[PDB]
Structure formats: C-alpha cells, structure tokens
C-alpha cells in the first residue's frame, strides 16, 4: 500500500490511504523519501512526524510505510561505528552519498551486510534453547567477544549449526519451534522504544573504578546505578563523561551525544581511536559505540538518540557484559521533547515541558541496572547510566534536573564558583550526594580489608566542618579560632588541592587506581591525624607545620606519581610520621 | 461481543465507533492484530463514539485489524483472606510469582464514602515502636498521620521501621499492614521487599508495588487499590489495618500527567482543579466504623519541596490529615535515626490516643510536659553567648537529640520502655517549675 | 502558471485556494492590483489550500484583482566569485547599485548538515590585529567566538576594526570576510559601509545589510544568507572566511515577532521553544572539513542583557559558542577596544597556537587583585612594593589593551609589545620559582 500527502506544516505531515500501516511505524515521506514516525491516525489519514527537514515537500507526494517500529540492528559490526539517532553509519553514509554532508531522504543499513565474519559454534545440535541462550560467538574485536544469542521470543530445539565464515544476513542456525522451522541470523532487529526483556533485576552493589579520586572516594557509582551530572556553562560535565568513557572497568561504552556541539563531537571522533585500553589492550574506539547528533541535527533524531543508545547497551548487557552509557546531554533531549509537545498543542506541565517528562525519564533510567540476562546460562549484566544535564544558568530547580534526580541515586552537581578555579571537577562536596556510599563503603572495605569507610566518613566530615569554617573565617581571621581548627582548615586545603583536584587531560593524573586512591588518602589523612595528635599536645601557636613544608610537597606529588610504581606513597606516609613526631621535641 | 471499529487513535487516546451500552470509567481490552492484549479505560462517551485511554501504550497498533471488548465494569479488585503475605502491582497483578489466589469477590476500587454519623472517633493506641512517636506525636487507630520530608531524608527507612514495629497490645484482632509504593525506583522497591522478607513482617503485610517506570494510570490506581484492600480486610474481616503509602508527591505528579494527556483544563500550579477532592477521597478512607471491629489507619509519606512557596500537596494533606510529622535533612546529617523534628510536628488526636488503660495513667502527664520541656531546652541554648540559668536546659536539649542517634531504625522501644525512659531521664534537677499536679508522678 | 485565487488575508498571512504542486517553505510573488510585486514564503500547505506570509507587508492588497505566482523553490542565494566587493540586502538583492552579477548557481540558504566524521578540528590562527584577541583570547579558523557589549559600547566599532585588521599569517591567502548587519540603525549601517569603503576592506569583504526598519522575516533570513555565502566561498572555492554578525539580540527579537505573527505556541519569556535549535542551525555552520582547504569562522556580536537573569540568547549563544569576549563600560569610560580580559575566555586557544599568556594573565590579575579590596589592597606593609604590579597593570590598561580602532597590531606587534610591559616587575619572578625561565627576559 502507498499513501498520499494531504498536509505539510513543519515537522508534521498528514497522509491519507494509510490503513495498512500502524502507529509508531517508520515511513518514507514525499518524493525525496524522508524518514518519519506515525504519531496519530484519523481513519485512513495518518499524522506523521518527519525526522529530517520538510522543506520542498507538498501534497500529492507518496508515502510508503516500512511496517516496523524504530529499528535497531544488533549484530557483528556494530562496535567501532558512528551512528546517528536512527542508527545509520556515518562513514558508510559519506562513502555512499559521495558528499561530506548528510543528504535528506537517504536510508542505509546500519551494519555491513556484505562483510564476512568468522562464526564459531559453541552448542551441539539438538540442545533445546529458549530466548536469550547463546549459540555461538564471533570475535568482533580482540577485547570484546560478540556472543551470537537467540533472538527474543524464539524458543525451540537446535536442528543444525556449524562454524564457518558467514555474513550477518546468512543463516547460521536452524531452530525447530512450535510454529515450525525458523532460521536464525547473526543480527537481530529490536525496537528502541521497548526495552529488552530480562529474567530478574537486582540491586547494583558492585562499585565501578572510574579512575577519578573525587568520584570513586566520596560520591561513587555502582555498575548498574544512575548518575546525573548537571553543570553550569562549561564546568566540565562532558569531560567527566569522557573520563568515565576512557577509564572504567566496564566491558563496553555507548556514548550518545544529543544536540551538542559538532566540533565537540569531532573531538570525540578524533581522540577516541587514538587511546588504548588501560591494561594495554586495543583502542578505545574498538570498545565503544558512538551515536553522534549535532545540535543542528533533526530534532526528532535527537529525541531518538538516547533510546537507540540504551537499546544497544541492553543488547550487550544481555550477553553478560558490563556496559556504561554516557548521554550528552539529556537537557537537549528534553528540549527536543518540549519542541514536539509544543508543536502538538499538548498541555504544558512545568516551564513548557510535557507533563509526562518524569514518566519518560523513569522509563529511560529504569532500563539501566544490574540484571540477570534471559536464558538458561543465568549470566549477569549491568548498564551504568551516566547522564549530563544542562540547566539554564545552572538552576537546579529546573524540571529536567528535578525529574532526573527523582529516579537516579548519584548526583554530581557542578558549581560555577568552583569552575572558576582549577577545580574543573567542581563537584560541590556539600551539595552533591550518593546513596551508594553505604553499600560501596561495605564492598570497598571488605575487598581491600582496610578501614576505608571510616576514612571516607572522616574526610567528608572534615569537608563539612570546613563548610562551617568557611563562614567562621570572615572578619575574624586565622589567628582567632583555635589552632586545632586552623589545622582543620589546612587539612581541608590538603584534601581539596591534592585529593579532590584532578586534571583529566593529564599524563598520569587522569588515572588513579584503587590502591593508589587508598594510599594517597592514607598519606593525607595520616598527615592530618598526626598533626591532630600533636597539636593539643604542645604545639606552638606560630610553630605548627613549618617543618613539614618539605614533606607536604610529597603529598602534592602524590597525584603525579605513576601507577606503575605502586609502593611510593607507602614510603611517603612513614616519612610524614617520622618528621612530625620529632619536630615537637 | 467484540467491536472491531476503531475510528481514530491520537497518542495514548483511542476513539471506538459504533458502540452501544458503554459507560464512563468502564475498562476495555484491545485485541491487537498481532494477538497482543492491552487494557484501557473509557474516558468519554458521545452517542456511539467512545474515547478511551490505553494503559500500556499505543505503539504498533493498526486500526483496521484490531478490535475492542467492553468488559462492562470499572476498575475492580478481587479480595480474599489469602491476600496476606503477597506482593501485587498497581492494578492487582501478582509480582511475587506466586499462586493465583481465588478471589472471594470483586469490589470497585473507588469505594464508597462513609456516612458522617456512621464514622467512629478513634480512641485506641498503636505501639509504633518509636519513642518520638509513641510518646510525643501518638498514633491512634484510624488517624491519618502523614510524614513530611526533604527529598532523600529519613523517610524510606522510617516507613519500613514503622511497618515492622507497629503493633497493638492485644491479640484480638490481629494486626495487619498494607504497604503501597507509588512511583519509586527498583532499588527502593527491593529495599522494602527485602526488609519485609528479612524481618518476617511480610507474613503480616500486603504490598502493592508500583515502580516509577510504570504507567501514570497505574500510578493513579495504586493508592486507591491499596485502600480498597485495606477497607476489605478491616471493615469485613475485623482486622486493624495500618496503611503506609510512599510516595504521594509522585501520585500528584502522575495525576498532572493524566490530566495533561486527557486535555483537561489545568487548574492552579498546573494541577487539576479536583486534586483537593481526589486527595480527600483517599485520606477520608481511614477511621473506625460504629459496629465494626476493624479500623483503617493511614500514614501517607511525601516529599516536600523547598523555597517553592507552599505547595498545595503538603498544605491540603496536612489540613485533611489530623496532624503531621516533620523531619529535616539537617537532622539526617546529624545522625538522628529516625530523624524526627518534634518541635513543628504535632498530633491532633493524641488526647484520645493515650489515657489510663489505653497506655498508662502517667503518659498524659508526661506528654504535655515533655512538649514544654524540649521547647524550653532547645530555646535555652539557641533562642529562635554565655549564660547559666538556661544552660542546664540547653544540655537537656543536646542529650535529647544525641540519645536518639544511638537508637537507629532497628530499635523497637515499647511503650513500657518509652515511659520508663521518660521518667528515668526526667529527674536530674527536680523542680516545682514543672507543672505536675502532685509529687507521686515525680518518682523518677 | 500563476493562480489568481486569493481566499483569505489575515494580517501578514495570506491563504491561496485551488493550488496544486505547492511545497513547504516555497517562495511566492504577489502581483497586486496596482502592479506592485511583493515576495512571500509558504508556511503551510493542505490539498488545494496554501498559507503564506508576505515579507514587505499586507497593506493595500485587493483579494479579487491580485494574483500569486509560485516560484517553486525555497529561499535561495546566487553565488559567484564576483560576489566579493558588493553590498546586498537581507534577501540578497544588490544594494550598492552596482553591476548585476551573473550567479554561478543558486543554493538553499538553510544549508545541509555536516557529517561529524567529515568535520575537522580547527587548528589554525587568525591575526585579528587587536592586542587582547591575539594574545589573550586567540581566535581559531573555525571557532565561534562571540562578543558581548553594553548598549552603545565599543561592540559597534570592534566589528569594523576586526573586519578590517583580520588577515592570515600563512602562505595560503584565500582570505575573505563576510559581514552581516542584523536589525541596526541606518547610522550604524553607514558607519560600517563608509568605514569599509574608506579603509578599502570592502574590496575583500561581502556585506549583507539589514536595517532595523526592515521586516522581521528578512531579519531572520539575513544571518543564514551570510553563512550560505560563507560556506560557498569556503567549501567550494578554497577560501578562509571570517563571518562577523551584529546584532544577534535583534535576530532573536525578530524571531519572537515571527512566531507571534504565526500564532505559534510560545515558550519561556515569550520566545519560541525552537529558538535553541534555530540558533544551533547557525552556529554549527562554522569549522573545517576533512579534505577541503577553506574554513568558516564566526564572530557573533550581541548586546548583553546581563545584570539581570540570563536571557536565553546570551545563555544559549555562550553555551554553543566555544568561549566569549566581555566588554565593560567602566573601561569604555576610561578611553580604552575596552576588552575586559578577566572574564573573557577562549576555549580553543590551545589549538589556535602560552608561556607569555599564562604569565600576563596572573600579572594583570595581580594588579587587579592589589585593587580587589578598597582602593589599593591593602596592607600598610605592602605599599609601594605591592604597587609595583598595579603600576604594571595600570600600564597594561593604558597602552596594551587600549591600542585604538585604527591601530593594526599584528602578531609581531602585539607579541613583542607584551614583553615590554613586564619590565615594570622584577625579572625572574613568574609564579612560581627562583629561575623558572631566565631566557629571553627582555
Ligand atoms: N577534570 C578536568 N581537569 C581540567 N580541565 C577540565 C576538566 N574537566 C573539564 N575541564 C575543562 O572544561 C572545558 C570543557 O567543559 P565541558 O566538559 O564541555 O563541560 P560543559 O559541557 O559544561 O561545557 C575544557 O576546556 C576543559 O579544559
Ligand atoms: N539530596 C537529594 N536531593 C535530591 N534528590 C534526592 C536526594 N537524595 C535522594 N534523592 C532522590 O529522591 C528520590 C525519592 O527519594 P525519597 O523517597 O524521598 O527518599 P527518602 O524516603 O529516603 O527521603 C530518590 O529516587 C532519590 O534518588
Ligand atoms: Mg556540554
Ligand atoms: Mg524510598
């Protein structure tokens, strides 16, 4: 069946003779064949929201339905690829259209259907399998093992399967189902609006090593948890997401950029394939799926970006891997929703955004989490959601930030005043929070067998008391309050400048292993603690730390100590001890 | 009896043509072309035309090949004594993957309003297990006592603590709890479920779980379903039921979403005008009934915004509820657990709650005096420097807050120990300034 | 074919009936009953009906005797190498009364989206000729660097001085400037035109003039037209193009007027909800392309509404733009371009070219920090010894930043002069070491 346009008005195009199509079906609209999504339908007439631009399209032009919802192709060839909101490869787009620009009305398959991949079967013929079981694997990269698993909704018995070189379109296995015989390919199509089903969800209690000191110490995020990063103008939220993308114990990374700067996206495309794995494995781009959408892209494609990305994350989570998805930025996504809801004459909720914003954000963030994948293998996967929020003028009271914080548990709020200094992390220790501090404290205390929870509570208490001291300092001076609290200020300065302050685009400061974190925190905390034991035990009012000026430089150097030499900070701590015990007498 | 005449589908709304005998708020089933079945509800009916809203959504629906069945009854709930010890969703579907319980009967979830002459005044006492509640803001069987707090303050743990440690000093009838989660994350869901199964309180409780990612229609139906089940177990089986709801602010937000989807005229602050009545129809479902054994006590728990004038949700809730419980994140930072700020917190029915026989003869004397005691104590150290005539009161306030740090959420302080600590710590500097009628109540 | 069936006329909008083959954003010409011709644009089309908006206006139109021609193409621009050295209006019609140039081809002014893979990172340097820009907030070929200015402050003349003193210090000499006036007074338009023809910069520049009394639709089309011409000259021929735009605030005000005339659902503060995307459509057109020689650089200049809550226009512009330039009336009163370099910051200066920069920044900031408190900060002991830095900073304002609007301090000029100022302070004193850089003390 073919349709006929009867009305064109901006992104909305109405077309009659669409009785055979269904709602949320993707269609080619007009003579150019632009991609559109069916929202409404009055009798035969259907209202379609066109993704691409609609300039030059009028009535009488035909419309043809694809017959499926938003398509994502999930198979070998998806890693090391740059897609748009609709999962279209940008490199293949450039090479096929022979133009450096994205032409309107061009549709291309997501994965290389003609590329040959080596399939290795790991199951015997005759073993009954349900939806989610693994029948083979392909070594898509040297790090990631792309496991060919059964598409969802197919349950049966394996008829024949054998290893060999095949494409993603060639059948590699036959399944005897209740309906009959069905052949399975190496690529499965899934709708991005509906989340991939699982067996059972569980609490994310395994903390992630992000390599960031301020993150992994005070406000940690677990494998499967959700974190929101709202920052003023240029406080550093995108670079925080970049850091989590490069240094993280996750298996795969899905970086969705929605409505951000084209140059800032090209920076990602440039620096990702030139960074290697922390353990000296392969390139960063060989373990990352990039979904780029310029600020100037089609508003609808920007709306579908996070859904495509989270669907790919669920596809790799169903295999049993740990995936981290980074969104930049969910505020631009919410503004796309605002534009669509305003052009559809829907009842505004708060500040022009649609009232179902909270519901949509809940639907997104609840898809991420540590779950048990479907299948008899009982494998476990996780999706860590890291999202960046762009509040107008940095107002946290904005509905986007409020609705995001209503469903996430990790909040890394950035501060303008802290961004003005070198503290580009700018995570306000007083304002920010993490409900995983309890669970992460338990885990990080048990696997390391150190009193790490007490260390973290003491450091955070020092920073809170420093927030009070920041008030008590005005107009009275340093000499006024007790020398004990003066030392408290110096210890808070030590934490702020040696532990909290962390440059991201540095040679060795960009990564701080777990052992290095504990050792650096030990140096700082034991410096403060030895001074605490000494000060009330006969410390001069002008002589407190003059003899430690040569050893505090070691603390300042702790952030530049290479991770290959692990046992250096332990030599720092003992010297701290020996110096401070004898300066008093 | 199936109608295969869908005329138009606009977003979550669908119009069915050529119908007859369709009523308002009638639930319907949509048989899609692929065989998938979706539930929905009638929102409007004009002649043979009928506008409905689908719960799950409207994705992938072809209007030509789909059909609609009209069941002929509104939102119902199947009630039965086997309901204890099970976990349901917002609409009543089981989530514990347990056996399908045979319902005794189906009841409309909206219920019916109680005749003012048939309502009974609450007079009994519930031992919540918290001293700050059982002695200062006493809970009464049938009293609607809300829990206000900042986002992420001491409320999720307080809900579980009350839901476990709540009991009466009787065995006839046996106590029951109905916990309703409305628009929460899966981690909070599992927090409540795991705590219940760990302490064994799930054996005497009925849980209605509605995740935040659930549809807004189910979020609206969740508290009404919980209160319907509570009314059944109380007014028909003679059980004293304690309902605990969290969170109610999410209910209000989802209701705003509902009215935004139904294109209704938005009232004040973007919320529907009937929000006040829709909240009243849920709060007034508590109380006792003349001639019935059971009782329904309600504890709604809500997030309060800060610096946003006064939100109608806290205002209307605190006005239709007999009292309120205030807590603060400053107290959560100070280690108070449960962090209950007793200065702005007030219970309006504690007078009938306590008495001789009900709790003890001295509880009524201790309550009225502890109010002024902690007031004077805190206002002595920080009004609204150095001095001594009120420093003795200052230290009282400090230890009053510090001894509630070391108790935690796992302390089940009975009424005996509560009154014992009351008089046992009342007597350090005995003074006649305390307004007691006689000295026999000054034995502590 | 030219329909003569005008059905409805409501304000600036007009509805033509019994049409066929009309497309979205299609251009139309109205042949009035008196012979006057007026241009317009299709806003909506439904079967045999088409709603359009007339650019010039709707006064004096007789619905019975007038007719409407459908051109069959959206807003287009005729591009050619002869475009250099001419002045056009907002829609592209010649304004200097010069020879009618034959267009090589017509291009849609909306442009097309650049593939993120095809985009290249800006790495070259533009010599703007102004001290602050060249040594403190360096401009990069392809960087969108805005300019903030108080109403009637040095922002209006900074445009002309940059547009003249911009040049490339490199073998490739495919330079070209594209200046775009958006809703300005005739006195400012003549300011720019006369300055260009006086200094001779008009010979190497393309001007798109749009007066404040011009229609809001033309005001919306002006910057997109300028960027279309820039992309032609840069990505089709091999030319480094520098676009300067003033003013941006007026563009947004006219966009509000547009949506008010189209009865669209307004967002916050009366602005359209798609204002963010509509500004993105213009800011992301700058940069370089892999495999192409040219580049497009943008300098939007706007009047700040600051000292009040951040309007969506400075907010979104400063968010999408990599950096910002701040000007202050406190410096404009002292005779200083009055570029306040403390809040000014360029986020691509690393690739644009740092030792002298990081040294000068804290140096002048230390003169301001010695003046941070009441009068000169601020301890009796500090006195003249602290005044050393503030003496240097007074000279930093008096002779380094304040160069004049007709002084072309090239990279050599500005770089060599910058070293002269530090002679006020002692010579081995860069924070922080004893002898951190003895060499080339000056
Ligand atoms: N950890 C860090 N250390 C040093 N600089 C940083 C860090 N994070 C961000 N930045 C700085 O912030 C700028 C980019 O900010 P960005 O990450 O885009 O945040 P936003 O999205 O708010 O603009 C860069 O110039 C970079 O130098
Ligand atoms: N300090 C905070 N600020 C904002 N939101 C928070 C904070 N702490 C927790 N939240 C979020 O608020 C949501 C609802 O929490 P809530 O039910 O109020 O917790 P509690 O009952 O412990 O107060 C949670 O999903 C959580 O992510
Ligand atoms: Mg950003
Ligand atoms: Mg909770």
**Which residue on chain A is closest to C283 by alpha carbon?**
A296
- What are the C-alpha distances in Å from C130 to residues A200, B92, C162, C343, C405? 64, 72, 7, 17, 9
Give the single-character DSSP code of B440: G
For B110-145, b/e burial (b = at least 16 CB within 10 A) is ebeebeeeeeeebbbbbbbbbbbbbbbbbbbbbbbb
Nearest ligand 1 atom to the CA of A264 is 18
Give the single-character DSSP code of A373: P
- What are the C-alpha distances in Å from C426 to residues B371, C385, C441? 70, 11, 10
Compute, in angstroms, the gap from residue A426 CA to the centroid of ligand 3.
14
Compute, in angstroms, the gap from residue A505 CA to the centroid of ligand 1.
9
- Out of B8, B186, B253, the one facing A358 most closely (by C-beta) is B253
Nearest ligand to the C-alpha of residue A415?
Answer: 1
SS (H, E, C) C305-367: CCCCCCCHHHHHHHHHCCEEEEECHHHHHCCCCCEEEEEEEECCHHHHCCHHHHHHHHHHHHH
Determine, for residues C116 and A7 on separate chains, whether the beta-carbon distance falls below 8 Å: no
> For residues B58 and B27, is the Cβ–Cβ distance under 8 A?
no
Determine, for residues B11 and A40 on separate chains, whether the beta-carbon distance falls below 8 Å: yes
List A291's β-bridge partners, or say none. A83, A256
| Cis preceding linkage at B247, omega within 30 | yes
Q: Which of the residues C73, C113, C346 would you substitute to probe the A interface, choosing the one with the greatest number of A C-beta atoms within 10 Å?
A: C113
Name every protein residue with a CB atom under 6 angstroms from any ligand 1 atom. A 231, 233-239, 424-425, 502-504; C 347
Please enumerate, as own/partner, the contacts of A514-519 that have beta carbons within 8 Å and a separation of 24 or more.
Answer: A514/A209, A514/A216, A514/A444, A514/A448, A515/A566, A516/A561, A516/A563, A516/A566, A516/A569, A517/A213, A517/A216, A517/A217, A518/A448, A518/A450, A518/A452, A518/A455, A519/A558, A519/A566, A519/A569, A519/A570, A519/A573
- Out of A22, A43, A369, the one facing B8 most closely (by C-beta) is A43
Give chains near C: 3+ CB pairs under 8 A.
A
Give chains near A: 3+ CB pairs under 8 A.
B, C
- How far apart CA A358 and CA A350 sit, in angstroms, is 11
Residues 335-374 of A with CB under 8 A from C: 335, 338-339, 342-343, 345, 351-352
Compute, in angstroms, the gap from residue A406 CA to the centroid of ligand 4.
10
Q: Which residues of A are less than 8 Å from B59 in CB distance?
A: 23-24, 69, 191, 193-194
Specify the resolution in Å.
4.2
Sheet strands (E) in A277-375? 288-294, 322-328, 348-350, 353-354, 371-372
Q: Which of the residues A296, A343, A353, A389 would you substitute to probe the C interface, choosing the one with the greatest number of C C-beta atoms within 10 Å?
A: A296
Q: Which residues of A are less than 8 Å from B263 in CB distance?
A: 347
Conformational region of residue C272, where left means phi above 0, alpha means psi within -120 to 50, and beta covers everything else: beta
**Which residue on chain A is closest to C115 by alpha carbon?**
A101
How many CB atoms within 10 Å of residue A408? 21
Pairing state between β A128-129 and C27-31: unpaired
Determine, for residues A409 and B64 on separate chains, whether the beta-carbon distance falls below 8 Å: no
> For residues A173 and A184, is the Cβ–Cβ distance under 8 A?
yes
Q: Does A92 touch chain C (CB under 8 A)?
A: no
List C242's β-bridge partners, or say none. C177, C297
| DSSP line for A455-495 | HHHHHHHHHHHHHHHHHHTTTT-TTTS-HHHHHHHHHHHHI
Q: Which residues of A are annotated as a binding site?
A: 231-238
Consecutive H or E run containing A578: helix A568-583
Name every protein residue with a CB atom under 6 angstroms from any ligand 2 atom. A 405-409, 433; B 149, 151-153, 155-156, 185, 247, 303
Half-sphere exposure of residue B382: CA atoms within 13 angstroms, side-chain side: 3
Nearest CA to C165 out of C139, C128, C204 is that of C128
- What are the C-alpha distances in Å from A84 to residues A30, A33, C159, C282, C391? 21, 17, 37, 20, 56
How many CB atoms within 10 Å of residue B224? 23
Q: Does B34 touch chain A (CB under 8 A)?
A: no
Q: Which residues contact B47 (CB under 8 A, 6 or more apart)?
A: none
Give the single-character DSSP code of C13: E
Q: Which residues contact C235 (CB under 8 A, 6 or more apart)?
A: A100, C289, C292, C294, C296
Pairing state between β A322-328 and C76-79: unpaired
Compute, in angstroms, the gap from residue B187 CA to the centroid of ligand 3.
29
Give chains near B: 3+ CB pairs under 8 A.
A
Q: Which residues of A are less than 8 Å from C280 in CB distance?
A: 259, 294-296
Q: Does A81 touch chain C (CB under 8 A)?
A: no
- How far apart CA C183 and CA C220 sit, in angstroms, is 10
- How far apart CA B266 and CA B213 sit, in angstroms, is 24
Determine, for residues A266 and C120 on separate chains, whether the beta-carbon distance falls below 8 Å: yes
Alpha helices in B200-311 (DSSP H): 216-235, 248-261, 275-283
For A353-382, b/e burial (b = at least 16 CB within 10 A) is bbbbbbbbbbbbbbbbbbbbbbbebebbbb
Burial class (CB in 10 A: 0-12, 13-18, 19+), A155: middle
> For residues A245 and A324, is the Cβ–Cβ distance under 8 A?
yes
**Residue B324 has which token pair?**
């309120």
Pairing state between β B205-211 and B87-88: parallel
Burial class (CB in 10 A: 0-12, 13-18, 19+), C188: buried
Determine, for residues C23 and A60 on separate chains, whether the beta-carbon distance falls below 8 Å: no
Find how far residue A176's CA is from the centre of its chain: 39
- How far apart CA A582 and CA A551 sit, in angstroms, is 14
How many CB atoms within 10 Å of residue B366? 23
**Residue B30 has which token pair?**
């949509």
Q: Which residues contact C297 (CB under 8 A, 6 or more apart)?
A: C122, C126, C139, C140, C141, C142, C143, C144, C240, C241, C242, C243, C286
**Residue C261 has which token pair?**
């005339």
Domain map (residue ranges) of chain B: 1-426
Please work out, in degrees rounded to the nearest 5, the angle formed at the alpha carbon of residue A320 by the alpha carbons of A317 and A322: 60
- Residue whose entry in the numeric block shows the structure tokens 């549809």: B215
Mutate to test the pocket of ligand 1, among A213, A260, A424 (most ligand atoms within 8 A of CB): A424
Half-sphere exposure of residue C412: CA atoms within 13 angstroms, side-chain side: 3
Nearest ligand 1 atom to the CA of C319 is 23
For atom 3 of ligand 2, which residue has the closest CA?
A: B151
> For residues A363 and B213, is the Cβ–Cβ distance under 8 A?
yes
- Residue whose entry in the numeric block shows the structure tokens 């979020």: B219
For C404-416, b/e burial (b = at least 16 CB within 10 A) is eeeebbebebbee
Task: Decide: helix, strand or coil at residue C178.
Answer: strand
Residue B341, min C-alpha distance to chain A (Å): 21
**Residue B257 has which token pair?**
């979403």
List C44's β-bridge partners, or say none. C51
Nearest ligand to the C-alpha of residue A414?
Answer: 1
Nearest ligand 1 atom to the CA of A329 is 21
**Residue C91 has which token pair?**
């829609």
Q: Which residues of A are less than 8 Å from B266 in CB distance?
A: 347
Q: Which residues of A are annotated as a binding site for ATP?
A: 231-238
- How far apart CA C245 and CA C222 sit, in angstroms, is 10
Give the single-character DSSP code of B85: T
Q: Does B324 touch chain A (CB under 8 A)?
A: no
Residue A342, min C-alpha distance to chain B (Å): 13
For atom 20 of ligand 1, which residue has the closest CA?
A: A234
Consecutive H or E run containing C179: strand C175-181
**Which residue on chain A is closest to B97 by alpha carbon?**
A200
Please work out, in degrees rounded to the nearest 5, the angle formed at the alpha carbon of residue A215 by the alpha carbons of A214 and A216: 105
Q: Which residues of C are less than 8 Å from A8 in CB distance?
A: 23-24, 44-46
Chains C and B touch each other (3 or more Cβ pairs < 8 A): no
Nearest CA to A560 out of A499, A482, A491, A508 is that of A508
Residue C186, min C-alpha distance to chain A (Å): 33
> For residues A491 and A424, is the Cβ–Cβ distance under 8 A?
no
For chain C, state the CA radius of gyration: 25
Residue A219, min C-alpha distance to chain B (Å): 15
């Amino acid at each position: 069946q073919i349709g006929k346009i009867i009305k064109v008005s901006g992104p909305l195009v109405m077309a009659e003779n669409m009785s055979e199509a269904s709602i949320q079906d993707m269609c080619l609209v007009g003579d150019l064949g632009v991609i559109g999504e069916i929202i409404e339908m009055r009798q035969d007439v259907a209202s379609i929201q066109v993704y691409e631009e609609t300039s030059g399209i009028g009535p009488g032009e035909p419309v043809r339905s694809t017959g499926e919802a938003l398509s994502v192709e999930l198979g070998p060839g998806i890693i090391s690829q740059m897609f748009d909101g609709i999962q279209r490869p940008l490199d293949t787009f450039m090479e096929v259209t022979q133009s450096n620009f994205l032409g309107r009305g061009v549709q291309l398959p997501a994965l290389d259907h003609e590329k040959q991949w080596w399939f290795e079967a790991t199951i015997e013929e005759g073993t009954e399998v349900s939806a989610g079981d693994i029948i083979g694997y392909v070594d898509e990269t040297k790090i990631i093992q792309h496991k060919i698993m059964v598409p969802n909704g197919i349950k049966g018995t394996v008829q024949k399967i054998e290893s060999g070189s095949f494409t993603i379109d060639d059948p590699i296995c036959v399944i005897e189902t209740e309906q009959g015989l069905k052949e399975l390919t190496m690529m499965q199509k899934w709708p991005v609006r509906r989340g991939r089903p699982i067996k059972q969800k569980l609490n994310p209690d395994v903390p992630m090593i992000t390599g960031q000191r301020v993150i992994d110490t005070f406000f940690p995020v677990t494998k499967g948890g959700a974190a929101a990063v709202p920052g003023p103008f240029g406080a550093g939220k995108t670079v925080v997401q970049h850091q989590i993308a490069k240094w993280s114990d996750v298996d795969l990374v899905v970086y969705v950029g929605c409505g951000e700067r084209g140059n800032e996206m090209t920076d990602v495309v440039n620096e990702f394939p030139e960074l290697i794995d922390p353990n000296t494995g392969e390139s960063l781009m060989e373990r990352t799926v990039l979904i780029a959408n310029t600020s100037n892209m089609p508003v609808a494609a920007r709306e579908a970006s996070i859904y495509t990305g989270i669907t790919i994350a669920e596809y790799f989570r169903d295999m049993g891997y740990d995936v981290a998805i980074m969104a930049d930025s969910t505020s631009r996504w919410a503004e796309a929703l605002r534009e669509m809801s305003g052009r559809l004459e829907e009842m505004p909720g708060d500040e022009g955004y649609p009232a179902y914003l909270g519901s949509r954000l809940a639907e997104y963030y609840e898809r991420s989490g540590r779950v048990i994948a479907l299948g008899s293998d009982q494998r476990e996967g996780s999706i860590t959601a890291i999202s960046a929020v762009s509040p107008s003028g940095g107002d946290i009271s904005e509905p986007v930030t409020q609705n995001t914080l209503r469903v996430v548990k990790v909040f890394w709020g950035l501060d303008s005043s802290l961004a003005q200094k070198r503290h580009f992390p700018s995570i306000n220790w007083i304002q920010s929070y993490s409900l995983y501090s309890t669970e992460v404290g338990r885990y990080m205390d048990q696997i390391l067998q150190q009193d790490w929870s007490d260390m973290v509570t003491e450091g955070m208490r020092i920073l809170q008391e420093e927030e009070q001291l920041n008030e008590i300092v005005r107009l009275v001076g340093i000499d006024s309050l007790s020398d004990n609290d003066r030392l408290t200020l110096e210890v808070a300065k030590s934490i702020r400048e040696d532990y909290l302050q962390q440059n991201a685009f540095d040679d060795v400061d960009t990564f701080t292993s777990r052992e290095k974190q504990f050792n650096m925190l030990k140096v700082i905390l034991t410096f403060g603690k030895e001074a605490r034991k000494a000060l009330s035990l006969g410390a001069y009012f002008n002589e407190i730390m003059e003899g430690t000026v040569a050893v505090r430089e070691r603390i300042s150097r702790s952030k530049y100590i290479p991770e290959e030499e692990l046992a250096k900070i332990s030599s720092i701590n003992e010297e701290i001890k020996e110096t401070i015990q004898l300066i008093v007498s | 009896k199936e109608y295969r005449t869908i005329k138009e589908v606009v977003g979550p709304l669908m119009a069915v043509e050529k119908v007859s005998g369709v009523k308002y708020e009638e639930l319907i089933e949509v048989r899609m072309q692929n065989g998938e079945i979706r539930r929905g509800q009638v929102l409007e009916v004009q002649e043979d035309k009928a506008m409905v809203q689908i719960f799950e959504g409207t994705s992938g629906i072809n209007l030509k090949n789909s059909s609609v069945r009209f069941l002929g009854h509104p939102l119902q709930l199947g009630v039965s004594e086997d309901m204890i010890g099970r976990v349901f969703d917002g609409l009543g579907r089981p989530k514990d993957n347990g056996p399908e319980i045979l319902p005794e009967k189906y009841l409309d979830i909206n219920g019916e309003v109680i005749n003012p002459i048939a309502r009974d005044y609450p007079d009994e006492f519930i031992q919540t297990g918290i001293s700050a509640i059982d002695h200062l803001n006493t809970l009464v069987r049938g009293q609607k006592l809300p829990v206000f707090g900042p986002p992420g303050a001491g409320k999720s743990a307080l809900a579980a603590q009350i839901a476990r440690q709540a009991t009466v000093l009787d065995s006839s009838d046996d106590f029951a709890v109905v916990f309703a989660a409305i628009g929460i994350t899966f981690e909070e869901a599992e927090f409540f479920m795991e705590d219940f199964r760990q302490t064994g309180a799930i054996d005497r409780s009925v849980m209605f779980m509605n995740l935040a990612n659930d549809p807004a229609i189910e979020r609206i139906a969740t508290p009404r379903m919980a209160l319907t089940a509570a009314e059944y177990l109380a007014y028909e089986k003679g059980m004293h039921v304690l309902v605990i709801m969290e969170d109610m602010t999410n209910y209000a937000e989802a209701l705003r979403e509902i009215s935004a989807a139904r294109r209704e005229v938005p009232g004040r602050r973007g919320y529907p005008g009937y929000l006040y009545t829709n909240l009243a129809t849920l709060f007034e479902r508590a109380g006792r009934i003349r001639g019935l054994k059971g009782s329904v006590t309600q504890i709604p728990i809500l997030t309060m915004p800060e610096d946003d004038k006064t939100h109608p949700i806290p205002d209307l809730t605190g006005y239709i509820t007999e009292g309120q419980i205030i807590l603060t994140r400053e107290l959560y930072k100070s280690g108070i657990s449960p962090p209950i700020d007793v200065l702005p917190s007030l219970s309006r029915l504690k007078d009938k709650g306590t008495g001789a026989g009900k709790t003890r003869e001295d509880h009524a004397a201790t309550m009225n005096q502890l109010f002024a005691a902690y007031a004077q104590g805190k206002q002595a150290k920080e009004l609204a420097a150095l001095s001594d005539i009120d420093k003795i009161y200052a230290k009282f306030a400090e230890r009053f807050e510090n001894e509630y740090v070391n108790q935690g959420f796992y302390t089940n302080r009975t009424i005996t120990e509560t009154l014992d600590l009351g008089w046992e710590l009342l007597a350090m500097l005995p003074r006649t300034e305390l307004k007691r009628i006689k000295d026999d109540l000054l034995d502590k």
